# Entry
Amino acid sequence: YEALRHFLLMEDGEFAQSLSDLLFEKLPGELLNPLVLNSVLSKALQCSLHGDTPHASNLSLALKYLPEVPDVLSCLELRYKVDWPLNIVITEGCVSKYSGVFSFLLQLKLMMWALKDVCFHLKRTAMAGSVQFRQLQLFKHEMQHFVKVIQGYIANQILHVTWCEFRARLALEEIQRAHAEYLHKAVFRGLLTEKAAPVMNVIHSIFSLVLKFRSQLHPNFALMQQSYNTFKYYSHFLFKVVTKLVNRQPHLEDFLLRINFNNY
Amino acid sequence: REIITLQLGQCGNQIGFEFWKQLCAEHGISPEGIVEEFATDRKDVFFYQADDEHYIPRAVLLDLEPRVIHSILNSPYAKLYNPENIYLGNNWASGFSQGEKIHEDIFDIIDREADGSDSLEGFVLCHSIAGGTGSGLGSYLLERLNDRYPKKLVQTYSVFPNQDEDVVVQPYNSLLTLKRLTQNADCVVVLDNTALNRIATDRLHIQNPSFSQINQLVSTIMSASTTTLRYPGYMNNDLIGLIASLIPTPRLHFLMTGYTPLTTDKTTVLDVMRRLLQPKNVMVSTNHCYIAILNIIQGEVDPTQVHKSLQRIRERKLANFIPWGPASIQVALSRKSPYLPSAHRVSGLMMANHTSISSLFERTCRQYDKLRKREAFLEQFRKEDMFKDNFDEMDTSREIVQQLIDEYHAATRPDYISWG
Amino acid sequence: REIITLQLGQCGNQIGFEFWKQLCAEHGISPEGIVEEFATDRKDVFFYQADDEHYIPRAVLLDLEPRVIHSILNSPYAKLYNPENIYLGNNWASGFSQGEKIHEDIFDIIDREADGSDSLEGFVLCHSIAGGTGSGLGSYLLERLNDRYPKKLVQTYSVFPNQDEDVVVQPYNSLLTLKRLTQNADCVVVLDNTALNRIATDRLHIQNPSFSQINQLVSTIMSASTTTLRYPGYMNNDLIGLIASLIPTPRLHFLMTGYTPLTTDKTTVLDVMRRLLQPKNVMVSTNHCYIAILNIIQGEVDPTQVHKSLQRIRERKLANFIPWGPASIQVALSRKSPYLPSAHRVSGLMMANHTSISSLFERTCRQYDKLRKREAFLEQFRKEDMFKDNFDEMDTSREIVQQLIDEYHAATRPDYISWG
# Structure
């Protein structure tokens, strides 16, 4: 349990921060074979610093669709396979949902990578004290803040409170139900629910717009002002849809409180 | 990645010695650096790991007119380190020129330590503003690193000198030092003598050995700010991930700190939050509003109270911050430390960008401008005379700090949508 | 193949005696040359092997005004050699004329030793520039061998005389000697008195018997440069394979050396590389760039660090060399020596062609040209008067060293694609 928490939910430090970071250097005509990714995993397991166990072994890492195709979307499935008397508790359907949330939390790390990339392109030319430099840097601060609040939301719900209700959940039949509720209260607060499907739906548009923001450095100021205005339009609608989906949830209550604080 | 520590000056080497004794007592190691069996941790950021697990610190020691450096030299913690890097006035231009002539072999010491590291994250320096030997020299080596490496970060922990005004060129020296700080550094953490004087006179009854207890509080702060590095966390385990949210703008990069117990010899998340909202629990002394605040908590916390608390923290509006845009407080959790008695269980550390510190800068500006109007307070020392015959660097620094204070006062405004 | 050693002059016979005592103590043999049972090696290059394994060295001894040659004569190492080859001013023309009259029987000594060898690789000579008796004579025998044998190599280890300027014809003598060195020799290894003075004053506190310790350092260098010959390696076990990469051009064939410990009474490959990058670990004192560098390392090395090191050595750009074309550093490994205490485990030796030595030549050129403008510094000695009545060989040498310095200064340029 406390091993799959570290890897399948990316709760260990310098493991996700080394696995995904090596993954993003490649991105594509590469990553088309399972001999490069499974050794990148062997390199990330070394710098985990905690683990190095046979529970940190026998992991299966695969891409269900190989990339043969603004794109931010990329899939990856990490699983751990358990022996036979414990397989009846940890089924292969629960680990599949762990991989389903794994892929989304992986897709989050691309954003703190790519915004850092455009910050770092700008960092090596940080020269001009003009208005055009500072005005650019402001858009980066605006876009970084929403990432830093949505990750802090995920780093409240899926790993703290649903883990609070797992150290007091434990009672042989009850153990299977305890694992089955750990997953269910994670997927409820993960907003993978069909009730909260629009609010998860706008987040991809957010991702694609900051990638197009990342593509340019300079090419032109006006296209960046336009992309930033689209970002501001979407974020302006987000605050309305989140209060509307409490007018019709306690975990969703904190989201509107997070995105707005001493402002409107 | 890996972070290299630097130390110079009398106050800087004092607080570095206290920091290393703090992390010696804090983790399970010997005063020669042998691991204790009874103790797991990462100490690979600020200490190089050896084969008998000698965690020799990444501390380069520079000295000038050594008196207390000799006391550092003969110590039972002098077996913890020996990187062979110790190499020999009270003016800015004096320390600048003394660093200028030996910039090559100290740069060899720098590059040797850089080769000791495989990767790198940042340089910290232990420095005090207008410390005499430290002042000017520290600005010079800041210039050397800023010329040499644009790929790394610099974090700086330095105090603001206030001795309640024989030395009258001190505002000039501090002004030139802070000029280099605004333009050649990326993030500054500054503190006051007077606020630590208040907390020390409140928690205790000492007046004369105040430096020693100041060192203790600096060590507790520097451990606290580094705990998510040294104890393995899972977010902002790079320095730049911590620094990124607080600083939107390259001149307003000054960060003020707080810490919840004044005396440390339940508390709930509500209590420690509202205590941390006080300026009397903050170690730095129109309405002023924060740009962004960060809090890290370490203790025996219950995870469900914390969302209750920030609900009610919105509801009471016990903070007043509105820069112009959606930048709010960030609360985080780190491990309550083992291997020491965990009394005063829950303790928080607080990191913000607030515009009020400009006023304190303005106080110094008011002093310096007054002395600049009289022009009798450089005392015609020969060092500042060689380094600038026309003394126009003081006027350039004056126009830069004028730009800085104007950026501060505009940064208060909710029309800071442009020029940010 | 086999390499024949030559020695002449006071400093040359001193350093040859020290080299033979070095290789006596280094390998397992007696001071009469009997092999020790307790000791395998090849000593067939610089020593002829006998039936009781008397490794009698290939050292031809020439003397003129012997004082220290007598001390070499009565010695406990005078049973190691006796090839029966010892045959009797301070001017270039004097030593030239004295070698001129006895060129036949010393050439008989040469051909006798050549018949002693089955095959041959090169001639080394022990010589000092402007050494008095050695100067002029050494140029003459260099002319004799260059006339006689175009099939072999000559390696030369000689020092640059600097006594911090009674002898004022010394720049003329050194100029004529180096003229013969550029045109009649294939590879030159030159050293400075001042750089060895710096290393000796740093490692120790001696000033007056500096010659003796200089001899020790020369012996360590000459053993190091020969270790892949004497201890069986598998590459560049011919001299010409070593020499071939460093010299593209027949006038710029001057090679400078370094060696990692200054005091020799872990180290990693990174440490010893960057130490060897210093000019203070190099025994010779616009931007100057190397043409090519060679390093040989001997010690307890780990083979996987070395590729890490040259990765990072590319990355830091801690060397600055760009002749015009793709000639870079060559790193090699030789055996850590047994039969002696292996303390200061890993030690490196460094061999490059660098253009900076031209400046030192230019310094001598500046002196000689000044004396040539005054023309009062030959002192009208009769020897230089017979050998050249018009003193036009000095002007010819001046135009040759002008061509040499111009070739050096063009060799710095990245347009050296032509005239290379």
Observations:
- Residues 183 and 251 of chain B are 7 Å apart (CA to CA).
